[PDB]
Subunit: 312 residues, 6 copies
């Protein structure tokens, strides 16, 4: 159920076939066409104008560089281009039509009243053009390539954490020292590292770009609740599985019995854990805010136990 | 070990390099060439004719629109095109050669007797042509883009279900009401929702398109067996992980002891579960049937328990 | 380590051999001798006068009826009898000497300065006499047959309770009723009786007579602590094992799911339990107080559980 | 299956009815008769002479003081008494006949060839006499009152130890100290006392007198084996249940994590335990050796555990 | 709550003090008096005649040898004796008065209308006499010494069996044989003996004599129920703890894997078990029937397990 | 943190936009340009020359076919091409600049001193050219398409294996045969197949091409350690999840008890398992060696148990 951006968010319109983006400028000569991505080119950014009235459910595509809006028509030439007036003409309103299968993240930009669909191709000219909406070709599909967004915050819904698996893992058994009887001090040292896992999966809301790099703040099961381990300072990649080391350190001493051989077994509960969360983002150029819901999942550890027992 | 369709199933031949499909028509002028996908164009569909005799193991590619077969030769011009007779000429028989790595779902269409390989590119003309089979280039690879198939049924192999993980999850503890002694009624209400998971992974047989949308029928562990929960009415996407809510509802009352404070703990076993299955499909245009084996996997819950205990 | 009564407590001196008790009266003629027990005869009761000075560690035996004290001598005749003055003569001081084996609850009453030991027999006259302390015969042994004491209170040392064994016992499984789906009410009834056990064992202090009948107040394990079940109104016999019935009663109803067959399993933890205690007693004739420490032991039950589960 | 002493062991013959013992001396006048027990009187001790030949299975009763043997006859007077020659006359051989119920530890001493049974009573004279073996009266029963035996050793059959019950008992939970983070030392102290139980029950062999006092050496479950705790220095009473204190002492320190609140739970497994054993005894006057098999039973504790866990 | 025999059951009246029994014959001269027990003497047996009308709640004591009834009066001499007419005179009706403590199994035989209590002593004549009921002495107490009864049957109330403790006991671990790979046969043998325990404790009904010897039929826990092991052919002693051996025997073979070292662990659940029961008895001389309820208790074993596991 | 190949390893430079590779030959005429991949064309292979001195951190791109190095300049024409001298000119040194998001596996090849960036496109000529480094377009990105490498060995770091989940799965219960008593032989057969899982995930080091086919050697949990099952002979695909069958076979016989019905339950522990590993590879053309660290993960089974129990 596709995410369409609200009015103040910018994006590029990437064509499935052309693998190129639409541009709209005042000059040079060709004012609208296709181009390889250049994040710094205002020329390639657009935002949507939500139609109202008989246009409710449709959208106008406003150029960020020129402020003009796109149009698609069949009678007059050229069939596509820019024009003033934020949607003054019926030629400026488009219906966003999601594709299926390999095109489920893509969609056509069909302008109803003229029965025309936007075209983006590099195999035939004009590269940026339109076609009778009834004949569907793959080069009529577009996807959103949103503006660079900064992930400002991650807020976990700890109350809804969940243990998906759990098996005890003995970190260190050995660590058993003796001295017959009397003695006095027997201290142990524990330093075990476990490779943990982390994945921030999209659930709903703003569609963050896969691989987006952001930082720390990862879930942990306490003993009766889930909590956030602010120490994990690794760099995460949105939508992808990352790994990180967790080291358990501990030092404890014993000796006080009639005379025994002390054994120390350090154990932890390891397993798969997951927690819901909400991410807060804002436009780097505008500060425009949005949110994204997601579920965080990972292999983790909890309940570090130290068991002491004497022998003879 | 690549899936080659039987004789009555249609498909498009998508080129790795051109990202375009082969077409074969009677008119306009250029009767065979490349084109962006248009699912409604019979022009782009083909089926295979299984070679026999000295042609066993080879195939002819029959156009659905014209009924003619493709050919690849080096002497006479043009080197590729259409021709009558379901494989009358040695020029019509092809060897399907699977690629590796990034080309493991692709293959070359090599016509042995002429030592020629089909070509599909957009960087050089002719776009649809052939090349000496000994010199291998990426633009010689094709993949099947099968006709739209309807998923008519999913039959789970319940006897072979399997619990991959299991940990108790307390849905609701609290829910403990008192009234000292005497009293008479103490009823509790349980309404807890768990986000479940679902994935239909391909194992063998017909290669269903990733993302194909179909409906319900998902596995559940009873107490000693696996069963199908027909209530889950969510829309699934083949080959992809989906999520769905499961709500546990229950109402029970107590009170009948010498006078106590009743506590109610509702618990469930949550964990990863998987089950084998077979999907039955048919051509939307023909009704031609095929099957696909797969393994279904998901995070689930089972064995809802309600424990009652008095206090003082 | 024998219990010798303090100065204000009365008792009878029962002879091992004679199986008769010593009496001391002013009249009839024979003022001191032996007699079968008659609890109402003041004639048979005595109390001890704790020696001091060079008599510390020795005792005088004062008659309750006459107030006179017993004496044991060898020169003058008769060798035993009564005399005024609470221990005026060296003839009135006795050493209490515990026996062993079958005589561990008995003891000789040896009067040191004369080297004489009290005698209590029915096979030879005089029945009540003495003998040279160096020649030990069984008829020189006595035991205390204390005055009737009332058990006023039992105070358990709950903090020190202890579970000696524990095994779950299913009181009632069956109790599973259905009605397919919809329905609305499904209430269960539980009434199970377990034969419990109870024994009040002597540990130290006043030696209560075995079989003494007294009432209620018996230990029970709560969930984290031991508590006293004041409901058990059975009559106990000190030092002996008693039995008593414990009935578990409960009524609870369910039904609120999409439609299932409800099962109810009522379970308890049964096992051996024991707890230390102190008993407070007083003389029925005097009100003289004493205490007795003991350990209470018994087969019991705890943690009644009711588990609800649906089926299909 | 009654224990009859071998030839070199001495005993007294206690009568059920008379509750007196048989004596055989050279002087004064009455050389054989009844008497209250006097352990120092050689006069009351006897040993058995195992019959052989046609007397196999019968026994002669030899006086320790005079060395003569007892006889029972009907023609000549007196019917019972002493005589020289270790069983020269048929009058000296007796059949030991065990009684039942309240007489299961008693037996008649029947002299077959004369059809006479020994009598021991105080209600009619002669007190020590005989009666026609066919008419059985309670005063014809005797029991062995063996000479004082010293318990020299107890050897447990550890390999055959057995846990009859087992339940964890938390000795001390609390003992949890914090200091936020950093800190450095957090040591705990454990001192918990449990009242243990001990009983040495007769199984076979020499019948040790109930209540016989002897010392230490009591079973304990290690972790995989049973062992003897030589520290328990309490005084035991054969055949009776004794109690003794067991104190667990321990001191251990921790602190070494990123900063937590340490909790320490000391736990033990308590339950009923039993082990077979053999006791070695010898005559205090002779050094004559014998053994006694038995099973030792008691409430004990094992596997002291110390579990460390941090909190926040 | 003392067991008084119904009309057709015979018994002896044993005196607490005299430790002798009452006899009633037609000749010799003294027709009623005291005597040491002689089970074969009809002379010592009596049965009760349950009073009715104004005598309801009282009893007459009928001699088995003479058929006459006992009487207790104060005016006429002798005060006690025999008389014809099954209770014709008011002198023949007695009130049975249970004692307490050491006399809880004894009772006085008080004849109300004359205010007299039966006496049984050997320290003063007449030995069998009576006394003013208001002055209570120990020699006024009697207890029942019932006729020899045969235990014909024991019927356990299996449904009410109960596990009081339970701990796994490994009978034999070792028994692990290898041969690398291939091989073919690896059979194990199990022969382990456990010393079990058995006690038949009185609960209610006929008071069987302690120590009474009878045979087999002992409880066992199956897997979900209790059953009777008819194989245990040991001789039991009523009211006392007995022991008996239980041997577990088993032979099983394996070998069929890719090549491993087989280990076999034979384990059982041992613990304390108890079950209610009813015993059926009858008079050896009459066949008169009675029952006795009781609880059976013992250390037992159940659920023999054999676990097979390979190694490398 | 991108993997840049050391000096002796060859690769192709695939353009993000052109999806074509760079070639450098001596003839025909155009000596440098773009081309679809042809693994056999030496023409398309290059290796890097690690800059030193003021060029440390930069690289020269040496053609394998010609041995010449690439250059990028702005003054002189053509702006890009080949040249002798392994980095003689400042024009030959490039900075490798990793992209983000969809370009995280791609990078620009920027030549600093001229402020120029390599270009690879098919939408505008020249296809292989350069651009002012300050204006970034997607067609400036390249990725490594390494030479075919052979996976010579996989060495698991068994000591660091880890159980992520664990749940018992009963392979076969039923298999329970009887014959009442006596009998003699009762053998069982076990043959159960479980579909296991396997995935070799990249962690660090050489970036093996996804899908690369190689063979066997997969982890297994023993009982206390992880070991390699050399039997699994399946073909794996690097970076992708594969499946494989595991069959448990076993034959064992019993019968040796007093007469029972034998039941056999075969059980295993199934769950998710993972283990670190290092793969050793070498160039197929050179033998040049490299390594790749990775974590192996899969659904597995361990601890096959066979439990034997009798019934009646
Ligand atoms: C200038 C103009 O009107 N040109 C059009 C062509 O674009 C058009 O070609 C097709 O356009 C579709 C767009 O979805 C596909 O790109 C397809 O491959 C093209 O064939 C033809 C009619 O087909 O008409 C004019 O020439
Ligand atoms: C009309 C004709 O015969 N043309 C051919 C060219 O197609 C051929 O070019 C190559 O074809 C392969 C196909 O796998 C690749 O597309 C490659 O990039 C092309 O260079 C050349 C010979 O190379 O010969 C004729 O011109
Ligand atoms: C009156 C008097 O002095 N009589 C004594 C006897 O009592 C005494 O007899 C013994 O006393 C002891 C007491 O422990 C035992 O009862 C034993 O059975 C008796 O024999 C004798 C000496 O033995 O002397 C006087 O007769
Ligand atoms: C000297 C002599 O021969 N006396 C006997 C009596 O002892 C005997 O009395 C009985 O003996 C038995 C012994 O088991 C019981 O003690 C019983 O109570 C006595 O009655 C009588 C015969 O009965 O004969 C002689 O008098
Ligand atoms: C023949 C006669 O009447 N004798 C009685 C005695 O028996 C009686 O003695 C007491 O009887 C009681 C019975 O409970 C105890 O045995 C006690 O020890 C005896 O003293 C006396 C009165 O006491 O009267 C007559 O002599
Ligand atoms: C021969 C020459 O110098 N040509 C250049 C063009 O390549 C250049 O065009 C752009 O190049 C970038 C490379 O990152 C993109 O491909 C972009 O789409 C092109 O517009 C133009 C200046 O833009 O200048 C010359 O014509």
């Amino acid at each position: 159920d596709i995410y369409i951006p609200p009015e103040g968010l910018y994006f590029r319109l990437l064509g499935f076939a052309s693998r190129q983006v639409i541009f709209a400028r005042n000059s040079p000569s060709p004012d609208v066409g296709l181009s390889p991505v250049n994040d710094q080119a205002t020329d390639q950014y657009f935002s949507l104008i939500y139609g109202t009235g008989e246009h409710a459910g449709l959208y106008a595509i406003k150029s960020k560089a020129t402020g003009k809006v796109l149009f698609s028509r069949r009678p007059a030439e050229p069939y596509v281009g820019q024009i003033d007036g934020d949607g003054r003409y019926p030629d400026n309103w488009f219906k966003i039509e999601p594709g299926k299968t390999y095109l489920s993240k893509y969609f056509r930009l069909v302008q109803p009243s003229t029965g025309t669909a936007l075209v983006s191709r590099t195999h035939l000219q004009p590269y940026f053009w339109n076609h009778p909406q009834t004949e569907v070709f793959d080069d009529q599909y577009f996807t959103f390539l949103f503006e660079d967004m900064s992930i400002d915050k991650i807020e976990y819904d700890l109350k809804d954490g969940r243990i998906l698996s759990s098996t005890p893992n003995v970190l260190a058994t050995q660590t058993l020292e003796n001295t017959s009887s009397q003695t006095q001090e027997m201290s142990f040292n524990l330093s075990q590292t476990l490779t943990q896992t982390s994945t921030f999966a999209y659930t709903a809301g703003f569609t963050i770009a896969v691989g987006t790099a952001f930082k720390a703040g990862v879930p942990i099961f306490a003993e009766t609740e889930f909590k956030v381990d602010i120490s994990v300072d690794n760099q995460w990649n949105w939508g992808e599985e990352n790994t990180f080391s967790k080291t358990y350190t501990a030092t404890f001493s014993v000796r006080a019995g009639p005379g025994e051989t002390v054994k120390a077994v350090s154990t932890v509960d390891s397993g798969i854990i997951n927690v819901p969360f909400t991410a807060y983002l804002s436009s780097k150029s505008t500060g425009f805010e949005v949110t994204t819901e997601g579920i965080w999942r990972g292999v983790s550890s909890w309940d570090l136990r130290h068991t002491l027992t004497s022998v003879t």
